[PDB]
Design an enzyme around this catalytic site. Sequence first.
Site, short mmCIF file in Angstrom:
data_model
loop_
_atom_site.label_atom_id
_atom_site.label_comp_id
_atom_site.label_asym_id
_atom_site.label_seq_id
_atom_site.Cartn_x
_atom_site.Cartn_y
_atom_site.Cartn_z
N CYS A 15 54.28 -12.41 10.12
CA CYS A 15 53.28 -13.07 10.95
C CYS A 15 53.44 -14.87 10.72
CB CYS A 15 52.02 -12.68 10.78
SG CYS A 15 51.13 -13.23 12.27
N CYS A 17 51.00 -16.39 10.80
CA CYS A 17 49.67 -16.89 10.03
C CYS A 17 49.66 -17.05 8.56
CB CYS A 17 48.56 -15.64 10.40
SG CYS A 17 48.82 -13.97 9.48
N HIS A 23 48.10 -7.27 8.64
CA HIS A 23 49.31 -6.39 9.60
C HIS A 23 49.98 -5.25 8.77
CE1 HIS A 23 49.25 -9.79 12.25
NE2 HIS A 23 49.37 -10.71 11.34
N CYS A 99 44.06 -13.29 13.82
CA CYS A 99 44.52 -13.73 12.49
C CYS A 99 45.08 -15.28 12.53
CB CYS A 99 45.53 -12.88 11.70
SG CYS A 99 46.99 -12.69 12.93
N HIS A 151 58.91 3.34 19.83
CA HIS A 151 57.77 2.96 20.81
C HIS A 151 58.36 1.82 21.73
CE1 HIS A 151 54.73 5.42 18.86
NE2 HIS A 151 54.62 4.46 17.85
O1 LIG Z 1 53.18 4.49 13.08
C1 LIG Z 1 53.31 3.90 13.84
N1 LIG Z 1 54.30 4.17 14.84
O2 LIG Z 1 55.14 5.34 14.55
C2 LIG Z 1 52.56 2.74 14.37
F1 LIG Z 1 52.58 2.21 15.68
C3 LIG Z 1 52.14 1.30 13.53
C4 LIG Z 1 52.54 1.13 12.40
C5 LIG Z 1 54.25 1.24 11.72
C6 LIG Z 1 54.51 1.23 10.62
C7 LIG Z 1 53.48 0.81 9.41
C8 LIG Z 1 52.37 0.92 9.86
C9 LIG Z 1 51.92 0.93 11.21
C10 LIG Z 1 51.18 2.35 13.79
C11 LIG Z 1 50.14 1.97 14.76
C12 LIG Z 1 49.32 3.10 15.34
C13 LIG Z 1 48.31 2.87 16.00
C14 LIG Z 1 48.28 1.54 16.91
C15 LIG Z 1 47.29 1.44 18.11
N2 LIG Z 1 47.43 0.28 19.09
C16 LIG Z 1 46.55 0.28 19.61
C17 LIG Z 1 45.40 0.97 19.85
F2 LIG Z 1 44.65 0.99 21.13
C18 LIG Z 1 45.31 2.11 19.26
N3 LIG Z 1 46.12 2.28 17.98
C19 LIG Z 1 49.22 0.72 16.47
C20 LIG Z 1 50.06 0.83 15.60
ZN LIG Z 2 53.80 6.44 13.40
ZN LIG Z 3 49.09 -12.62 11.47
#
Ligand SMILES: O=C(NO)[C@]1(F)[C@H](c2ccccc2)[C@H]1c1ccc(-c2ncc(F)cn2)cc1
Ligand SMILES: [Zn+2]
Ligand SMILES: [Zn+2]
Length: 380
Positions: A15, A17, A23, A99, A151
């Site tokens: 990022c 920031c 993050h 951030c 995703h």
């Molecule tokens: O595990 C994941 N995907 O398989 C994630 F999307 C991201 C991540 C990846 C790698 C390392 C750390 C994290 C975590 C994640 C989970 C939930 C959200 C999320 N977003 C919006 C929301 F409203 C609720 N949960 C965002 C990211």
């Molecule tokens: Zn995951």
């Molecule tokens: Zn940031």
Amino acid sequence: TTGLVYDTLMLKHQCTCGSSSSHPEHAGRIQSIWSRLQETGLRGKCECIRGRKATLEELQTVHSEAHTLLYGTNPANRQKLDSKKLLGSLASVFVRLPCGGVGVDSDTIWNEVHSAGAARLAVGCVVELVFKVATGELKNGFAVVRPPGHHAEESTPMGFCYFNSVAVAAKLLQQRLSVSKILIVDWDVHHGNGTQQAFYSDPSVLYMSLHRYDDGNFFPGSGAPDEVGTGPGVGFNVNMAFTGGLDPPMGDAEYLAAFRTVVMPIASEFAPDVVLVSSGFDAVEGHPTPLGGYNLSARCFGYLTKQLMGLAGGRIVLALEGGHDLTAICDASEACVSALLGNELDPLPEKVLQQRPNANAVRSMEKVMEIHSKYWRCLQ
Ligand SMILES: O=C(NO)[C@]1(F)[C@H](c2ccccc2)[C@H]1c1ccc(-c2ncc(F)cn2)cc1
Ligand SMILES: [Zn+2]
Ligand SMILES: [Zn+2]
Ligand code: NA
């Protein structure tokens, strides 16, 4: 022989920031996995391949041309290469984040100098590895890559993903080697919304996801058990969706059960030529909600690997997705490579091997088995 792939230019996705401490998907993640495989001697026993960046053409097997131009180029070439004038105004895309850094939505970051290169390198690495396994050059492999992919939808980036590396790997395998049957297993705790979409109508690709679903109250909210595919793809999209929350949280015995009664009988009937795994590690203990909530042990992933290696002549390739707790992802990664090399696996607890799966898991496994009993000889 077993392949690995890793490249430090993926460490530059950070990022603007300046502090990665805002993050969760951070450079440290792949960095620490890598040193763990080094200091345990597992890396030195693998073929370490040179990865590359994917072409825009490759990326467009899954993603719109617009999306690929946007998230696959630096600012200068983005304008030069978009001769069709597909993109609108960038002011309509970039937001400021709490951030102080630049985002694409309320929490996915974007570094206009480094993110495009890192994302294409993630896809390119996984592709190369997968193509080496499919062509007999290697037995199997592990892709230590970031940012994650599963995703990433056709023209929408979410959950820190921009390009579905695994989906791309699959399409190329079809397009360029005409591989007739591919299995995608996704064991990341979150549903792989992108991958489901990319093969929903395609019966030459079986997508199997094990995830926390909870009436769709858990990120990303997709992946319900009755989402069974469309068209000729009916039956070939299997969502092992767990439900009922943390009462109790799911563990090794619940997953081992799922694999025995659901995943492996369908995998075996389908009978694929190549197994690909979206290998996220957020189901391991030490991942508080919304990141995880489950209480699996990193060791368990060694055993899951070994069950899948029995399919597809051993032609299996795993690629990192989610996973946050460093000890967790490093232990799990060690287990997976270790299995991949043919080593004897660190044992599971006697209590775990003897445990019946909790009620919510049985209620969850029943629902799936009733839904998919229509499409598969093995569940009827
Ligand atoms: O595990 C994941 N995907 O398989 C994630 F999307 C991201 C991540 C990846 C790698 C390392 C750390 C994290 C975590 C994640 C989970 C939930 C959200 C999320 N977003 C919006 C929301 F409203 C609720 N949960 C965002 C990211
Ligand atoms: Zn995951
Ligand atoms: Zn940031
Ligand atoms: Na999943």
